[PDB]
Amino acid sequence: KTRIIEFCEFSEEERRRYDDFASKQSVNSLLVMKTNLDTNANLAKKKSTAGFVLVQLRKLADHPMLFRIHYKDDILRQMAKAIMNEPQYKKANELYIFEDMQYMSDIELHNLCCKFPSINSFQLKDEPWMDATKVRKLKKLLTNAVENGDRVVLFSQFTQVLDILQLVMKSLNLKFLRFDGSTQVDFRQDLIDQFYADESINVFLLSTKAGGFGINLACANMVILYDVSFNPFDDLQAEDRAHRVGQKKEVTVYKFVVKDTIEEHIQRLANAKIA
């Protein structure tokens, strides 16, 4: 367990969204007072702490194709026109299907069109997943599984980020097994045993909800955290699966970061106290 916290510089496409997300997020309501029933002096001040702002950022920080960046609004209509030729056909469904769809992200909307093959005219987009700061530094980190026979153990904050990675690894190296956070039914085995074979079963995708009370084998030397967390509940317990004394080689822990984004800020940037 050697801490290496390799930052990851911007792109043009990534800043495009993040820098232009200083405007819409900057709602002109706090530091203008909209008119209510009575003197709502602090109600609107505490209508603030809209942490959706925060969480949205800490998802922008992460893989930016889980935002709405492919189907604007009207391509979901062509899906909705070219999906009623199926068993999904009730009395009146053409507005409620397009409404329920238009709140799903571009990962949920990709994960039905390729699995349920009834809308295949505009599913793929030349693999837009690979094009992302973190996935390309991850493309660089798979080269550490080229020099040597190295297997990795990879963690995820949000479930959608797993589902991105579920089809990131249908592009560079093949994928086989998605260890979800909601896999705490009764001591999992088949999803954790037949692993560590040469080149057809290399890397396996873990989650936050997957507890830290236990671990698995430490043969997996490298560990990559896609994102960074909030409190000390899984600081050390997620990051002690290769904190051993019986290893025989080097073993480095790894967590992704960004350029000049709030993710760098929650990995503290302030100042220590000379007391």
Judge if 208 and 246 occupy the same domain: yes
Say whether both 186 and 142 belong to one domain.
yes
Is residue 142 assigned to a domain?
yes
Q: Is residue 121 part of a domain?
A: no
Count of domains observed in the chain: 2
Cβ-based burial of 156 (10 A; exposed 0-12, middle 13-18, buried ≥19) = buried
Strand order in the sheet with 2-4: 2-4, 252-255, 222-225, 152-155, 204-205
In a domain, 122, yes or no: no
Q: How many residues does the chain have?
A: 275
Does residue 48 share a domain with residue 3? Answer: no
Count of CB atoms situated within 10 Å of the CB of 246: 5
**Which residue range(s) make up the domain with 73?**
10-113
Whether residue 202 sits in one domain with residue 274: yes
The answer as to whether 119 is a domain residue is: no
- Kindly provide the b/e burial profile for residues 107-128, where b requires at least 16 CB atoms within 10 angstroms of the residue's own CB: bebbbbbeeeeebeeeeeeeee
- In the chain, alpha helices (H): 12-20, 52-60, 75-81, 96-102, 110-113, 133-141, 144-147, 159-166, 262-266
Give, in order, the Cα–Cα distances in Å from 153 to each of 45, 116, 160, 219: 43, 30, 18, 10
* Cα distance between residue 55 and residue 240, in whole Å: 26
Query: Residue 213 belongs to a domain with what CATH number?
Result: 3.40.50.300
Q: How far apart are the first and last CA of the chain?
A: 30
CB 262 within 8 Å of CB 54: yes
The verdict on 257 and 232 lying in the same domain is yes
Shared-domain flag, residues 36 and 53: yes
Token pair 């080149």 is found at: 199
Would you say 182 and 139 are in contact if contact means Cβ atoms under 8 Å apart?
A: no
If you search the block for the tokens 């579920």, which residue do you land on?
166
Q: At residue 84, what is the residue type?
A: M
With beta carbons less than 8 A apart as the criterion, state whether 176 and 200 touch.
Answer: yes
Distance separating alpha carbons of residues 25 and 192, to the nearest angstrom: 42
CA distances from 32 to 20, 23, 234 (A): 22, 16, 41
CA distance 201 to 143: 16
- Residues 260/11, Cβ–Cβ less than 8 Å: no
Interior angle at CA 163, CA 60 and CA 118, nearest 5: 115
Q: How was this structure determined?
A: X-ray
Q: Indicate whether 78 and 159 sit together in one domain.
A: no
Q: Which residue has the tokens 């469904």?
A: 93
Domain final residue pick, 113, 148, 175:
113
Q: What share of the chain is helix, strand, coil (3-state, %, to 5)?
A: 25, 5, 70
Angstrom distance (rounded) from CA 136 to CA 223: 16
Helix (H, G, I), strand (E, B) or coil at 99: helix
- From the list 33, 264, 34, the residue with the least C-alpha distance to 133 is 264
Co-location of 147 and 208 in the same domain: yes
Smallest CA-to-CA distance from 166 within 66, 58, 17 is with 66
Q: Which 3-state string (H, E, C) describes 60-75?
A: HCCCHHHCCCCCCCCH
- Say if residue 136 is in the same domain as residue 239: yes
Query: Which of the listed residues 85, 113, 141 is the one where a domain comes to its end?
Result: 113
CA distance 171 to 179: 19
Same domain, 264 and 185: yes
Dihedral Cα 18, 239, 153, 168, nearest 10 deg = -10
